[PDB]
Amino acid sequence: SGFRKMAFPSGKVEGCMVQVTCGTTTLNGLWLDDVVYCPRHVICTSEDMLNPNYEDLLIRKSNHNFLVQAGNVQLRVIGHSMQNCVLKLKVDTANPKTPKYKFVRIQPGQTFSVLACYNGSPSGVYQCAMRPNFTIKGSFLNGSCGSVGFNIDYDCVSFCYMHHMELPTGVHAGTDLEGNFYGPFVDRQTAQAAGTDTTITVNVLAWLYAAVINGDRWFLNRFTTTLNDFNLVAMKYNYEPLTQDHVDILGPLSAQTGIAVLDMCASLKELLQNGMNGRTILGSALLEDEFTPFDVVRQC
Amino acid sequence: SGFRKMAFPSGKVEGCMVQVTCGTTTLNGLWLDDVVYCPRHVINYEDLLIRKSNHNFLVQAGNVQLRVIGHSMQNCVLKLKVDTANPKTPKYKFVRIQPGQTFSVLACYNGSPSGVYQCAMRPNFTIKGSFLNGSCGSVGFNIDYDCVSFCYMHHMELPTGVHAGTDLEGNFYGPFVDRQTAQAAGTDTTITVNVLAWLYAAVINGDRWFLNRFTTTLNDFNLVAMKYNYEPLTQDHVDILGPLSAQTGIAVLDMCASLKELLQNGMNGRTILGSALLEDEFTPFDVVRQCSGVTF
Numbered sequence: 001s002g003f004r005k006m007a008f009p010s011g012k013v014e015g016c017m018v019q020v021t022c023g024t025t026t027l028n029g030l031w032l033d034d035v036v037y038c039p040r041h042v043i044c045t046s047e048d049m050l051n052p053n054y055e056d057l058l059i060r061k062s063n064h065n066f067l068v069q070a071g072n073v074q075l076r077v078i079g080h081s082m083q084n085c086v087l088k089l090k091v092d093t094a095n096p097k098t099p100k101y102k103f104v105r106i107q108p109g110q111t112f113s114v115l116a117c118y119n120g121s122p123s124g125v126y127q128c129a130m131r132p133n134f135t136i137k138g139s140f141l142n143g144s145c146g147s148v149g150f151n152i153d154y155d156c157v158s159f160c161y162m163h164h165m166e167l168p169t170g171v172h173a174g175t176d177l178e179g180n181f182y183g184p185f186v187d188r189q190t191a192q193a194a195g196t197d198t199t200i201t202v203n204v205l206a207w208l209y210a211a212v213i214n215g216d217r218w219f220l221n222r223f224t225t226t227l228n229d230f231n232l233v234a235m236k237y238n239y240e241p242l243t244q245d246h247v248d249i250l251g252p253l254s255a256q257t258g259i260a261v262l263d264m265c266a267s268l269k270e271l272l273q274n275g276m277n278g279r280t281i282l283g284s285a286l287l288e289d290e291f292t293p294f295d296v297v298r299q300c
Numbered sequence: 301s302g303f304r305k306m307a308f309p310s311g312k313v314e315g316c317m318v319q320v321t322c323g324t325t326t327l328n329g330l331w332l333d334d335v336v337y338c339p340r341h342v343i344n345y346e347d348l349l350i351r352k353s354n355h356n357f358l359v360q361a362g363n364v365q366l367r368v369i370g371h372s373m374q375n376c377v378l379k380l381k382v383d384t385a386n387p388k389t390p391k392y393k394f395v396r397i398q399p400g401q402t403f404s405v406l407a408c409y410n411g412s413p414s415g416v417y418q419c420a421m422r423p424n425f426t427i428k429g430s431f432l433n434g435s436c437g438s439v440g441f442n443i444d445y446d447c448v449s450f451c452y453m454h455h456m457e458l459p460t461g462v463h464a465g466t467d468l469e470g471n472f473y474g475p476f477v478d479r480q481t482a483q484a485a486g487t488d489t490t491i492t493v494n495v496l497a498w499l500y501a502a503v504i505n506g507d508r509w510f511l512n513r514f515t516t517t518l519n520d521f522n523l524v525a526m527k528y529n530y531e532p533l534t535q536d537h538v539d540i541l542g543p544l545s546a547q548t549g550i551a552v553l554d555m556c557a558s559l560k561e562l563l564q565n566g567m568n569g570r571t572i573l574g575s576a577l578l579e580d581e582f583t584p585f586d587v588v589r590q591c592s593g594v595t596f
C-alpha cells in the first residue's frame with residue numbers, strides 16, 4: 001500500500017554524467033560508449049545567443065576547445081558533430097559504465113525521472129511529466145543544462161529528454177537525445193513563451209484508479225457519461241481531451257477495480273464541479289496528473 | 301526555478317542491494333564490505349536463529365550467489381557474514397534520524413532496485429512510503445558529500461497503509477515490534493519546521509501571496525500550533541531557519557505569523573508551489589540544498 005511519486009533508480013545514469021566546458025560555458029554531458037552528448041548552446045557566447053548560427057560557430061571549433069571531465073579524469077575529444085540541437089563529442093575512451101540504452105522520443109503526458117546535475121555531478125533525482133504544452137516543470141538552476149530525463153525498463157535505460165533552457169515562467173524546455181526540441185521552442189534567447197498548460201486527463205483518471213486500489217472511494221458516484229459529454233465538461237476546466245486511445249489504455253485499471261472508464265470519468269466530472277471539500281485523495285488536495293496509467297499499474 | 305520532491309542519487313546504494321532468501325521468505329539485503337544486513341523476520345528470534353545454518357540463507361548479488369560464512373543478530377536486523385567483500389561498497393555510516401528528518405528510499409524487490417523516493421520520518425515514527433510485498437529490507441539514506449548515511453531499513457506495513465522500520469543497528473523507529481500482532485500508528489502531527497522551510501522555498505521561487513506584515517512570539521505561535529496538530533517549534537528550529545530568513549528577508553517569527561494565518565484561514569483556492577496543502581517533507585537543509593544546487 002501507499003502511493004508515492006517515485007523516480008527510477010539513477011545509478012545507471014550517474015555513471016554517464018560528465019562535465020563539458022567550452023570557453024566560459026560549463027554544462028553537463030551524457031557519456032555513452034565513445035560519445036558525449038550535450039546541448040549545442042555550449043559553443044555559444046554573449047553576442048551569439050539571440051541569433052546563433054550553430055553551423056558557423058561549430059566549424060570554427062577544434063576538438064581541443066572542448067574540455068570533457070569524467071570525475072577527476074579529463075577525456076580527449078577526437079571529433080565533433082551536431083545533430084539538430086545536440087552536440088556529439090567523439091571521445092577516445094568508451095564509458096565502461098555504459099548501460100543498455102535507447103533514445104526514445106516521448107509524447108505529452110509521459111513521465112520520466114530527471115537526474116539534475118551541476119558540473120557533471122549528480123545532485124538529485126525527481127520525477128516529472130512532459131506537459132501538454134511540451135514544457136517540463138522541473139527544478140533546475142544555472143549549470144543544469146545537459147541534465148537528462150529517462151525511464152528504466154528491464155535493465156534498459158531509455159533516454160527521452162535533455163535539458164536546454166528555462167522559459168520566463170520558470171518552466172523548462174529541452175530536446176530528445178537526437179536534439180529535436182519538444183514543443184515550438186528554439187535554442188535562441190529570443191522571446192519565447194510556453195502555451196497555456198492543461199491537465200493530463202488520462203493521468204488524473206489513472207491516479208483516481210490508484211486511489212481506488214488503495215481503498216479511497218469517497219469521490220466515486222452512481223453516474224456514467226458519454227466520452228463527448230466528458231470532453232465538453234473537462235475542456236472547461238483546461239483539461240486535455242480524452243481520446244478513445246486513453247479509454248483503451250485505462251482498460252486494465254477499469255478491469256482490476258470494476259469501475260468502467262466512463263464511470264470514473266463521471267467521478268472526475270463531479271470532482272471538477274465540487275472540489276475536494278476538505279478531503280484528500282492519496283494525500284493530495286489537488287488532482288494529480290503526473291502518473292500515467294503504466295506508472296499506476298507498475299507501482300500498484 | 302522549480303521545486304520538486306527530490307531524492308539523493310541512488311547509485312551508491314544500488315550497488316549494495318542483494319536478494320536474501322531463507323526458507324519460503326525472499327526479501328532485500330544491504331551488502332556493505334563482507335556483511336549483508338536484512339530484517340531478522342526473514343528467519344523467539346534467538347531460538348529460531350540458532351536452528352538456522354549458513355547454507356539455509358541464499359544470498360544473491362545480481363546473477364551471482366554469495367556464500368554465507370556466519371550469522372548474528374543485532375536487535376531486529378540479521379547480519380549475514382559473506383566470503384566476498386562488496387567491491388561497490390561506498391563510504392558509509394549508520395545513523396539514526398529524528399522525526400521530521402527526511403531521507404531517500406530505494407524501494408527493491410528480489411534484490412533489484414525499482415524506484416527511489418524522498419520522504420520524512422513522521423513525528424509518529426512511521427513513514428508514508430510506497431511498498432508492496434517483497435519490499436522488506438529496502439533502505440533509506442542520505443548522501444553527505446561522498447558518504448552514504450544509512451538511516452532506515454523497511455520491516456513492515458501497518459493497517460493504515462503506513463510503514464515501520466528500523467535504523468541499520470536494528471532499533472525500530474517508534475513503538476513497533478516485528479511480530480504479527482495488533483499495532484497502530486499514533487496520531488500524526490505536521491512537521492512545523494519543515495512547513496516553514498517549504499514556505500521559504502516558495503518565497504525563493506516567487507510565491508509571496510501568503511506573506512503578511514505580522515510577526516508573532518514563539519510561545520503564541522506554539523499555542524496556535526498545538527491546536528492544529530502541528531509539532532512545537534523550538535529555538536533550535538528558529539536557528540536552523542536562520543539562513544533562509546536572511547536570504548529572503550522574512551524573519552522566522554514573521555513567517556510563523558504567515559503560517560498561523562494559513563492555518564486559521566486556509567489557502568482560499570490558492571496554491572503554494574503547486575500544492576493546496578502545506579508540505580512538510582522538505583527540511584530546512586533540503587530547501588537550501590535544492591535552491592543552491594549541492595552535488596553528490
Ligand SMILES: CO[C@@]1(C(=O)Nc2cncc3ccccc23)CCOc2cc(F)c(Cl)cc21
Nearest residue numbers: 041140141142144164165166186187188189301
Ligand atoms: C544558457 O542557458 C540559458 C538557460 O535557460 N539556462 C537555464 C536552464 N535551466 C535552468 C535555469 C535556471 C536559471 C537560469 C538559467 C537556467 C540561459 C538563458 O538564456 C538561454 C537561452 C537559450 F536559448 C538557451 Cl537554449 C539557454 C539559455
